[PDB]
Amino acid sequence: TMEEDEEVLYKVRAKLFRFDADAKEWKERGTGDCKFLKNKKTNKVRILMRRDKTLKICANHIIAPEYTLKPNVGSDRSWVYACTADIAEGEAEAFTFAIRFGSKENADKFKEEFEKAQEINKK
Amino acid sequence: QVQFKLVLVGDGGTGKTTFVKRHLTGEFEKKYVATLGVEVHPLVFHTNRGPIKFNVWDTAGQEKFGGLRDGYYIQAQCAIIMFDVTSRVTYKNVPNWHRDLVRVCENIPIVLCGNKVDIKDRKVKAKSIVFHRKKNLQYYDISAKSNYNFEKPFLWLARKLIGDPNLEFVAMPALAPPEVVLAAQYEHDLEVAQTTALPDEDDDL
Amino acid sequence: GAMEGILDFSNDLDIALLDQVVSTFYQGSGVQQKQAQEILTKFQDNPDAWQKADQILQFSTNPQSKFIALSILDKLITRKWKLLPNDHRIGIRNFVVGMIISMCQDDEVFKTQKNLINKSDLTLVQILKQEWPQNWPEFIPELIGSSSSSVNVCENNMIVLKLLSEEVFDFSAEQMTQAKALHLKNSMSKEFEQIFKLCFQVLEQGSSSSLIVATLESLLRYLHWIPYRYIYETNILELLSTKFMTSPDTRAITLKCLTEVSNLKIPQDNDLIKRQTVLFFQNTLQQIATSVMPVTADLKATYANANGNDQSFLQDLAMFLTTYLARNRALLESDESLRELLLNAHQYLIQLSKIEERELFKTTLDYWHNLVADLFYEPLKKHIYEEICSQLRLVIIENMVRPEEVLVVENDEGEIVREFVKESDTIQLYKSEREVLVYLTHLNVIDTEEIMISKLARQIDGSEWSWHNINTLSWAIGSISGTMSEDTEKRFVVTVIKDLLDLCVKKRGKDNKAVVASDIMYVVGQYPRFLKAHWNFLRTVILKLFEFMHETHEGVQDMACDTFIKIVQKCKYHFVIQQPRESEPFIQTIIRDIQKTTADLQPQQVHTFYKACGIIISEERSVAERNRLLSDLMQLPNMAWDTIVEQSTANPLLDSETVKIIANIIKTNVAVCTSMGADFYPQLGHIYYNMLQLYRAVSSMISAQVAAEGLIATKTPKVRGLRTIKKEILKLVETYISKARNLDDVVKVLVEPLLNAVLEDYMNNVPDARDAEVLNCMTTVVEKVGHMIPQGVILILQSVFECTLDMINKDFTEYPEHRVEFYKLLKVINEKSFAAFLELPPAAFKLFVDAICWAFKHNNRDVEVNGLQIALDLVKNIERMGNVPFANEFHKNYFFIFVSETFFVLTDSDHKSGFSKQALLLMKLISLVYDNKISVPLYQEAEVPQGTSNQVYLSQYLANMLSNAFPHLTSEQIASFLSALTKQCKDLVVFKGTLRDFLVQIKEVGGDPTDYLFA
């Protein structure tokens, strides 16, 4: 499973989307627990998210210091950001993600923790 | 790792392709683009008995787009028969799909699925769904839209095919992801993403 | 690519190439497979591809290639058989028969190419449907003769006969005309004596071979239709119930045969037959006990192990036992010597009922309901089953599924959490279980109390304590409410509550408390009779629910709200009167503390709380007192409203917090209006005029935002929040008007300001800013007072008709909600205020007719059904007018448009769900001409001779229409169809049969025109 060597810094239910630039539309990639995981040997913090029931990975990438969380025009409980290397489906690939939460409170908490993890990764 | 041919059949518009797509990519396709003949998709699940691969033959339900029809069923090792609980005609046609299927595939595990249970005005009442009993089919209420029971058909089939009643889906290994940054990168592509509204903003998540 | 060669028919077919393409399709992957699939589909669909069939069958080295060759032939046989030259029909028959003969003779091919042989057999059967018996009278005799020559041939002949029986009796209804199905059923019936004789001979001299299995599979099909004498006057029941139950190879199919035998049409005054029916059951159960498993066996364990075919066998045994006993158990109930058989059979069912398999449990539970419902009524029967019923009580109580009211559930980490979604698929199961347990409790209330009370004992002492055990028990206790006497219930409920309160004290941690909380709330909500008798306890329950409204466990909190309203719906009278030894009706106390009580609830939970208070207040029938209670209840939302109305009118952009406050105020009014209905009027009057002013102001903000930011503005949180305000205002007005009892005040006071505020705003917004809820509100307005506001109804049509039509008439998908609400509005206007359509200008009326026909081309049932109903209602509306110029012009302009449009959706195969209502509309239209209810000629002066009747012209028009739309039909087919259809236009059932026959004939060539004489 490859998560026993990591501390869970933060966990929250979320729906993750990926932007399809060709279709010009957002498409759902998964709904489940989104976790911030800090490796005990490298101190590096990643996002790992798995779908309910199938437990398949729908996000797996470092919370890079250069990423920035931006609002979506349709929502006060979501963030959109560009990710250069996600390995959820195998080979490293660039995506524009959107992650939406149950409330604005949850979205704001996520940004707060997202940015904490970014500072952790720079150290 | 060995794979199993799964054939998916049922009336046009019952949600066969949408169901498979949900499993392949996690998306929910709102549009109805009718399948032409068959679309074949590999689908892997991770279990406590190792990976299981389904080769999903998602067939056309519209008669005018039926293609090879029962020709698709040759050497199928399992099947899903789909109907729409908001459309009584689609349940009425279940015995026709079953007939055509078992004539080619005489002894395979088959799940009957009543899709679209998210829709409030249900037309095929729970009490009415009995066709599976005398034919030894498993039955599930499902919704590809809300994901209600969406994993159940595949979990049941995997149990029958691998021959292990206590087979469970398990969490796939999560490899360490890489570090990256191309110095000359300009994506105004983010601004298009930001200004395209996310779908279903009234949903719980 | 090289693969496309097979599509060039000018050249000779490269069989090697074809086999490569087929193999690439079935055994390949990715792009190669996809390309191969397209090529093969194109090949199959070539209308001369069948001429290659024999060549492929002769030379191919690929079984799948030959399967595809047979599918091509099947397509030809089923659709174009009679288009063929006669020598081509003979050639095709000959090489299909020969291929089958050939494949059966070679043992290796017979063994390993079963798919191809089965496909060949079905193809032969398609030819028989066309050719037999009239052009093939010796098929059955020669099949029988051929059977003795070889075991392989005999076996295959059973497959052919099975397929023929299926096609003729089980699947003919949709695929053949009534006349053709009767012809083939009669033909099979006439030669069945010989078929059965062969079948019986094989079964007599064979044990458990593949030939025997095949013969039994064919027997299963015959049992659907054959006369009972073939089963009861031969020795076949002995063979099925003894010999064929012993070998597992034949056991599966024999059990299903015996299940179908239990459904035969059979004399019920015949002692000899009754004994045969008893004997086969006796034999069958004896073979089970001696060859499979004893009655004591753990079938739960066996099913769970899922060895070989055990699950399917246990399922089929369940079906056999339930089917037989539901029909025949009375045969076993009087004779002392049959008592052990009766009970052993039921004991097997008891054991089957312990299996963990939902769908199987439902099957057995259906049987138990049949049993206990009979024991509830039938003298002197229940005592026979007392031991079975006692075991059944235990099974049901231990397998109770979660009621919809229980909102907590255990997650994968062992934590008790609020459910993410409703368990929609267990609602019916719970109801079925409760039905059975209720009957079981009436049958023995003492046994039931004892089982429950002692199970509860073992939870307290800790011996069987578990969430699962306390849960199923609590759910069972709640589900039997109503079965006991008030006095026994009193003592029972008291004991239960005592014990559950003990558990709550003893079991610590929030997961334990959440579970026991859920269970006590469920139980107390299920016993309102008790609550009504015990005020002090009722008061204490409600006050405790109020404490739970402060719980941080979201599941408990939410269930507390649902339980409060559930209790209030039943006990409201006790909240409205002043109880002995209280200083005020409890409703006063509830209202006075409403701010404290609901402080931690989410808005929607708050609205539910207010809705419950509305239920109580509507019990007060003194109007002065009722209105004061209503006033007191709405104090908080009215004070918030008043300050917002002073702000808004002081100076209009509403920030997001103010928009949320407003929406929740209106939602609170909606909640209270829903429960109070007609009694809500004084509160509506307090806010009405300012509310419509707010609607206008919010509308300007939305419009302003779309103007400054573009259509994307409508996706933003601010604009979505503004539209929520408009939607809830419309919902409140709709909700009130739908329940109003003073319709004069609705018209004099409510309607004019409403139309003024909503109609022009709808009309003059861009499509994406129009609320479909406006149409919904207008439907209720027309429905309730439409007859009193003829000019208002005209104003509604003027404002929404043409602009909404233009939104929805470019495709079937855009603006789904507007689409649905649009046709609901037209339907009610057409029913209630038809004059509104009479006032339309001719061009707009034409659009209305267009709109209706557009509706019945939808596959969306909401739209389609209303479209067909509107059309039917419109015809009735025109007819009522009698012989007047508008009716005459209507028919001249539109009668044939309706006839042809209805025919189009009848015959196009994409609107099968609408068949019944399409047929009804068509029959009405045709009957109008055949009762001479159209006063003017439907034709032009030039078309046809002066004085020609409308009946003669209608036939002429339809024959022409059908002739051009279906050119493969003969003139006689069309003339015969119309003759029949026209003559049957007063008899819907026959009329529909004739339509179904026509739908069969258009799928093929050379349909027999005499079929339309069926009667």
Ligand SMILES: Nc1nc2c(ncn2[C@@H]2O[C@H](COP(=O)(O)OP(=O)(O)NP(=O)(O)O)[C@@H](O)[C@H]2O)c(=O)[nH]1
């Ligand atoms: N509400 C709801 N809609 C669904 C669900 N599943 C599918 N749909 C919708 O139903 C329509 C048909 O879906 P689709 O998968 O194309 O059906 P299909 O059975 O593959 N049709 P075909 O046999 O012609 O290829 C789509 O608009 C889709 O969004 C569901 O669970 N709920």
Ligand SMILES: *[C@H](CC(=O)OC(C)C)n1cnc(-c2cc(OC)cc(C(F)(F)F)c2)n1
């Ligand atoms: C146990 C449940 C509990 O307290 O859990 C919370 C979350 C801490 N418990 C103790 N007392 C009750 C109780 C008592 C009542 O008195 C008449 C009434 C109820 C009610 F459910 F019916 F409201 C509950 N529950």
Ligand SMILES: [Cl-]
């Ligand atoms: Cl084959």
Ligand SMILES: [Cl-]
């Ligand atoms: Cl009451």
Ligand SMILES: [Cl-]
């Ligand atoms: Cl003719």
Ligand SMILES: [Mg+2]
């Ligand atoms: Mg499809």
